[PDB]
């Protein structure tokens, strides 16, 4: 333990001494290579130290006007490497990712296809890394990638693994872009089929249940006979799944929302039954469920006063 203490006490002396020298160098106005090596040392272990990323940027900006095209091109490739080594160690620092956009945003021809491949690498390591997905969205835009490949990219990632909340969210933003209206039914139906598949494959998979609730709201009876049969078919599949997972709260809730989506008043008795079974399985959500049930019983009272 004393060697671990003493080394970290020195890593201090070294983090502290390097930090000190960087700031000394900064008032002085020595915007040079010295600073890049010192910050290279500090930023590797603490990339949340934001001021130092700023120094690096300042040095690099100064040397775009003391070095040649070639010398400056070498500096950025060196910066790219540095960045990638910083990300392997902390793939979740805001400053590292923003420095990478900063750098790439000011290059002449940047290799965006390289950068999209980097995101695919980082996303197989951590499919939930929101910083990586945000960076991927930046690279896609900077490089005028079309919503269809990004949507094709999302097809892959769901089937491959079960860390899909981030992928289903991306789908939720991409589909509106394929059909830009201030969802079409054919599309809704196709997406409804992807999602049930996902949650019968793995019923404990909460992300698909959440995406599915969105799909249910996304545009009564103006229920076509197709949609009406698809929803009815979804309802029985969840009952089947309820017999298999009596503890599964997500399919129970979904059953309630399906019946709402079909016919509030006709399925009123079973909705009430379903709320009680559900509150018995998910007691922590007791209050939410009572409030949902009250909201629906109000809607059911409004629908009945529209009578004759």
């Amino acid at each position: 333990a004393e060697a671990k203490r003493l080394e970290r006490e020195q890593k201090l002396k070294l983090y502290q001494s390097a930090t000190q020298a960087v700031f000394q160098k900064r008032q002085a106005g020595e915007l040079d290579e010295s600073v890049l090596e010192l910050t290279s040392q500090i930023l590797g272990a603490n990339p949340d130290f934001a001021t130092l990323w700023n120094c690096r940027r300042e040095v690099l900006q100064h040397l775009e006007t003391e070095k040649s095209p070639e010398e400056s091109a070498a500096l950025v490739k060196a910066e790219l490497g540095f960045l990638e080594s910083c990300l392997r160690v902390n793939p979740k620092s805001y400053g590292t990712w923003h420095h990478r956009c900063w750098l790439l945003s000011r290059l002449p021809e940047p290799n965006w296809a390289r950068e999209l491949e980097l995101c695919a690498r980082f996303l197989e390591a951590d499919e939930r890394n929101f910083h990586c997905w945000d960076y991927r969205r930046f690279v896609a835009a900077q490089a005028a990638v079309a919503p269809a490949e990004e949507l094709a990219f999302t097809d892959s990632l769901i089937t491959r693994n079960f860390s899909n909340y981030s992928s289903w969210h991306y789908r939720s933003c991409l589909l509106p872009q394929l059909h830009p209206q201030p969802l079409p039914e054919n599309v809704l139906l196709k997406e409804l089929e992807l999602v049930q598949n996902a949650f019968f494959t793995d019923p404990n998979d909460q992300s698909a249940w959440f995406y599915h609730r969105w799909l249910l709201g996304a545009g009564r009876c103006e229920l076509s006979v197709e949609k009406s049969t698809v929803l009815q078919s979804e309802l029985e599949s969840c009952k089947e799944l309820q017999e298999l997972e009596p503890e599964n709260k997500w399919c129970l809730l979904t059953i309630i929302l399906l019946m709402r989506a079909l016919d509030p008043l006709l399925y009123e008795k079973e909705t009430l039954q379903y709320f009680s079974t559900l509150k018995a399985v998910d007691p922590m959500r007791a209050a939410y469920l009572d409030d949902l049930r009250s909201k629906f019983l109000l809607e059911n009272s409004v629908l009945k006063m529209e009578y004759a």
């Binding site: 700031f23 934001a50 909340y165 939720s172 404990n204 992300s207 959440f210 969105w214």
Partner: protein
Amino acid sequence: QKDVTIKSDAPDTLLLEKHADYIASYGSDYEYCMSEYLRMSGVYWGLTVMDLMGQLHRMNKEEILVFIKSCQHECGGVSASIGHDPHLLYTLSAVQILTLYDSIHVINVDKVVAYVQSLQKEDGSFAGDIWGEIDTRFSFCAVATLALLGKLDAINVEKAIEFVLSCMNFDGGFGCRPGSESHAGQIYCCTGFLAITSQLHQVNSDLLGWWLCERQLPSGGLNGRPEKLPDVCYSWWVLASLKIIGRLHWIDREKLRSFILACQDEETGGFADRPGDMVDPFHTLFGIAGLSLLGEEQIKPVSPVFCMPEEVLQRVNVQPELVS
């Protein structure tokens, strides 16, 4: 599925006096100096939690005020520490502290305002500093700073609202930027922003409240998004978010309280991340703030918007109407 398991001999009692002493003594270590890059906010967290416990006098006002004036730069923004660079985050923290102390003219208020104004973009967003990072975190830092100062009118508020709303997602939550996935820390920033700008009627509270309350794991702790482990930080953000939107009761208050108390270190004091992990002033503030919002009578009432004593906000006449 992923959850912490609380031990039977984790604390179930509130150790106020241990926490005050922990905060009163914090700063007299290793990760203390490793965290100089967020010193200003670190000071905010300690000061704020001490004041929530009525123990503010035990901190060094005079010293802290000098530190602050020396952290304001010529652009008018404020840095995290001396010699570090200005940023919206530390500008917020400095103004929150100056407001705790009724001492805002310690800094140049007009310069701060201009600084905050300078960082707004065409589409209504805010950059964190001159290097251009856009994040709804900074939309909150700007309007939070400006409202504690009475200068919300200084920025294009309509465009700011429009940007924040473009970050609203299919699940009723918010992320960093348009297209960004929903996350509890971003939900807190955006709902706090909409509270300040009077736009809570634009939130789908039942849909967002559902997403939020599904954060609570069987341990009683809350996570920041699906599949993640619960902790005290996410516990504050979610709860505070729920309270802003009128839905704090959608959570099991008893189970959450007990989670938070299990995060106390009964020997050293302070609060930790999750039970028996190592304590810090960040989770100490958010543990105490979280317990106050749940209704702990030993702790002053805490604003879920500014994460400051209500009584502080009452003095300066800034109290956003919340949903319900």
